[PDB]
Design a protein around this ligand. Structure first.
Ligand SMILES: [Ca+2]
Lengths: 189, 196
């Protein structure tokens, strides 16, 4: 009974990801986005946008990776990308994934490590989607996150190679979006 | 001005942007700390993650990645149709059919049909994938009600008899998860979280 008990303890504990607030507001500006609903959104993108991945990418695995990528933030908190972290997240991973049975603890902690390293095919596609989504959001909200955080083209352009690493097509989309964003005054030069 | 060859990707992105709105649709399930109601997007995150974690309890014929995808999209229709509490008897079919047409209709035609069908499959709870998806979706609120000491059950007058009507849906996806769920509900009744 202790295997399922451990699994259920993890399922219950990770509810707390819903409480971890990002700097992003929702597209309706009503409230801050949380980590759990953000991971839902990116994971959904992995399936919708699967055709743009390299052939080696395992889309279901990318989805699983994206669903678990921010679990460490339960203990480590959220940091805005444009603003100790590694150590806090390592400790978080040990405690949180440590709730699982040992096989799954090792599997999921390694899958999270793999996401952070952004080396493998799956990790690059995952990371590309995660980096793409705030561009889509910011364009839709006329710079709703960029403006209140004083984000510049320099800081955004620096992240574009991460999208390109996951998909040349999505990279090209992102570049055109950023240029038009600056044109329109959504993003400071 | 989106050139004609960019049409497919633009349609896909229009859907990606639109579905932000799922985050604003609230359920009656509380977070485990009773701090607020759960929203549909974070609910779908949670159940899709459970699909992967609890995969070993699925029938051999289930494709777990497909279950995950199905769960990620299963509530998109609620953007337009809203949430309906499972025990609330009082046009849901028509609302949801119209929602599906508008929302999935943002996608390119191949994916509009694909994703609509996948949602329909989930709702029908006939296929192996749909049964496992539905079992996970029905288990999670039980977990939360146990954590919140009947934080949804009591205010809504939910009784053991009403919950017992739902438990076979869990059993239909996994006998082991069904047994867990029944034992959890037995304990909830003993603790007074759930009217007998
Ligand atoms: Ca509930």
């Amino acid at each position: 009974e202790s295997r399922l008990a451990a699994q259920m303890s993890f399922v219950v504990e990770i509810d707390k990801l819903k409480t971890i607030l990002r700097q992003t507001l929702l597209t309706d500006s009503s409230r801050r986005e949380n980590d759990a609903e953000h991971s839902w959104h990116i994971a959904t993108m992995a399936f919708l946008l699967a055709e743009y991945a390299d052939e080696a990418v395992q889309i279901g695995r990318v989805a699983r990776m994206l669903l678990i990528h921010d679990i460490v933030e339960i203990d480590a908190g959220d940091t805005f990308i444009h603003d100790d972290k590694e150590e806090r997240e390592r400790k978080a991973a040990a405690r949180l994934f440590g709730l699982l049975p040992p096989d799954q603890a090792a599997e999921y902690s390694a899958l999270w490590q793999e996401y952070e390293a952004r080396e493998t095919a799956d990790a690059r596609f995952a990371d590309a989607l995660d980096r793409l989504q705030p561009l889509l959001h910011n364009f839709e909200t006329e710079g709703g996150t960029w403006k209140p955080h004083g984000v510049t083209r320099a800081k955004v352009d620096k992240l574009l190679p991460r999208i390109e690493a996951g998909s040349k097509r999505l990279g090209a989309y992102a570049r055109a979006l950023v240029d038009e964003a600056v044109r329109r005054g959504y993003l400071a030069p």
